[PDB]
Short mmCIF file of C-alpha atoms in Angstrom, two decimals:
data_model
loop_
_atom_site.label_atom_id
_atom_site.label_comp_id
_atom_site.label_asym_id
_atom_site.label_seq_id
_atom_site.Cartn_x
_atom_site.Cartn_y
_atom_site.Cartn_z
CA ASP A 1 80.68 97.70 104.49
CA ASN A 2 79.99 98.19 108.20
CA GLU A 3 82.95 96.38 109.77
CA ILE A 4 85.48 95.67 107.01
CA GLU A 5 85.40 96.34 103.26
CA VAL A 6 87.83 95.53 100.46
CA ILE A 7 87.00 95.84 96.76
CA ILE A 8 89.24 94.08 94.25
CA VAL A 9 88.70 94.34 90.51
CA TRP A 10 91.49 94.44 87.94
CA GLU A 11 91.44 95.01 84.20
CA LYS A 12 93.55 93.34 81.49
CA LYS A 13 95.48 95.35 78.92
CA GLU B 20 89.63 106.39 102.00
CA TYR B 21 90.63 103.78 99.42
CA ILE B 22 94.22 103.31 98.27
CA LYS B 23 95.49 101.69 95.07
CA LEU B 24 97.54 98.61 95.92
CA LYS B 25 99.14 97.03 92.86
CA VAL B 26 99.52 93.35 93.70
CA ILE B 27 101.81 91.94 91.02
CA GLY B 28 102.47 88.22 91.08
CA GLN B 29 105.34 86.27 89.54
CA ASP B 30 103.62 85.07 86.37
CA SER B 31 102.08 88.24 84.92
CA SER B 32 99.09 87.87 87.26
CA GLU B 33 98.20 91.44 88.21
CA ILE B 34 95.17 92.55 90.23
CA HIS B 35 93.94 96.00 91.34
CA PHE B 36 93.14 96.30 95.05
CA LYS B 37 91.10 98.95 96.87
CA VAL B 38 91.60 98.85 100.64
CA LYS B 39 90.46 101.26 103.35
CA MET B 40 93.03 102.89 105.64
CA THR B 41 90.98 101.72 108.63
CA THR B 42 90.84 98.03 107.70
CA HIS B 43 93.75 95.66 108.39
CA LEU B 44 95.92 94.09 105.69
CA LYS B 45 94.88 90.65 106.93
CA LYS B 46 91.65 90.93 104.94
CA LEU B 47 93.66 92.08 101.91
CA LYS B 48 95.73 88.91 102.19
CA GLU B 49 92.53 86.83 102.38
CA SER B 50 91.08 88.48 99.26
CA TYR B 51 94.16 87.70 97.16
CA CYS B 52 94.38 84.10 98.41
CA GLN B 53 90.73 83.28 97.60
CA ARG B 54 90.87 84.98 94.18
CA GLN B 55 94.10 83.15 93.30
CA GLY B 56 93.69 79.71 94.87
CA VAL B 57 96.80 79.69 97.06
CA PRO B 58 97.15 78.96 100.82
CA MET B 59 97.64 82.01 103.07
CA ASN B 60 101.21 80.82 103.72
CA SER B 61 102.38 79.74 100.26
CA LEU B 62 103.15 83.37 99.41
CA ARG B 63 104.73 86.43 101.07
CA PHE B 64 103.99 90.14 100.60
CA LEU B 65 106.46 93.03 100.75
CA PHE B 66 106.54 96.84 100.85
CA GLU B 67 109.40 99.35 100.73
CA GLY B 68 111.47 96.22 100.28
CA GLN B 69 110.75 95.05 103.83
CA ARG B 70 108.21 92.35 104.67
CA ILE B 71 104.60 93.04 105.67
CA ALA B 72 103.15 92.30 109.10
CA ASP B 73 99.92 90.33 109.29
CA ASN B 74 98.39 93.06 111.50
CA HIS B 75 99.94 95.86 109.45
CA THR B 76 97.86 98.66 107.89
CA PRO B 77 98.70 101.97 106.15
CA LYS B 78 98.08 103.18 109.69
CA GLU B 79 101.70 102.08 110.10
CA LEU B 80 103.02 102.07 106.52
CA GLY B 81 101.66 105.47 105.55
CA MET B 82 101.11 103.96 102.13
CA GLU B 83 99.76 106.73 99.89
CA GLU B 84 97.74 105.93 96.77
CA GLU B 85 99.16 104.16 93.71
CA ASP B 86 101.46 102.24 96.06
CA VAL B 87 102.82 98.84 95.12
CA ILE B 88 103.16 95.49 96.87
CA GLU B 89 105.35 92.60 95.77
CA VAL B 90 104.42 88.97 96.35
CA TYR B 91 107.01 86.22 96.31
CA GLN B 92 106.43 82.47 96.25
CA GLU B 93 107.51 81.19 99.66
CA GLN B 94 110.50 78.87 99.79
CA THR B 95 113.23 77.57 102.11
CA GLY B 96 116.78 76.26 101.75
CA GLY B 97 117.70 72.61 101.21
#
């Protein structure tokens, strides 16, 4: 959030 | 701010990634390795065909949104 931030969320078909 | 990085593996394992253009790709590599159970080395990531630096960042790749990244199981000759 402050320093580094990476959001990973996939979705299956 | 956030770009869409399509990390497609080699076994139908796909995952959607949201990374900031200010953060390095080293943290992106860490996120995929922990969510997949595979040593940082074991794999290899590519873009525009050419390999990806460990310190790289769209700051250098100018990766727009919807971009794509390929991951290949690491190997060597015999």
